[PDB]
Design a protein around this ligand. Sequence first.
Ligand SMILES: Cc1cc2nc3c(=O)[nH]c(=O)nc-3n(C[C@H](O)[C@H](O)[C@H](O)COP(=O)(O)O)c2cc1C
Length: 174
Amino acid sequence: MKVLVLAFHPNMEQSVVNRAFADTLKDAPGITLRDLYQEYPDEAIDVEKEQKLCEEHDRIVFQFPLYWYSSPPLLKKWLDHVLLYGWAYGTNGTALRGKEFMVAVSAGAPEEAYQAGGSNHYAISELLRPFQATSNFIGTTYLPPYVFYQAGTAGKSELAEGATQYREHVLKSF
Ligand SMILES: Cc1cc2nc3c(=O)[nH]c(=O)nc-3n(C[C@H](O)[C@H](O)[C@H](O)COP(=O)(O)O)c2cc1C
């Protein structure tokens, strides 16, 4: 029901794919969409603010483009700075236990590339393992990701169908 979408794109105005995906949620009740590079242009994160928002939602969605098979660096900094002892883990660290955790990621390469025998050799499930392990450690339930391939070169209509598929997935109950 209550879904926090944390979008991590260095320039959401120049973005093509993630911008389109984000647009489909600007009116869905229950959705809190945020543009983190926009809110923290100097990457100085308000830890308590972030923590408090996670607390108030039932599902947390990390949305980003696939950059070198990982995320943009602000998400990495977000994990490091926000997920603290006594909050996310550790003795009292139980604030996220029970909440849902999912990744929505767009990739330039085709789906064919992400498999054994394909040009990138590994399935997306393999590449996203740091995020799944993060989920595992902090007590959240790891949901299947939303993945969009051929991002940027897939075509006008394909992108539109991709966007509507993104919306259904993010709102889907599992
Ligand atoms: C620095 C950088 C690294 C990238 N690394 C990958 C990658 O490892 N695998 C891949 O499929 N695409 C990669 N891409 C292409 C992006 O995934 C693609 O631009 C993005 O998913 C969708 O773009 P948009 O939301 O900004 O429109 C990379 C792009 C940039 C700029």
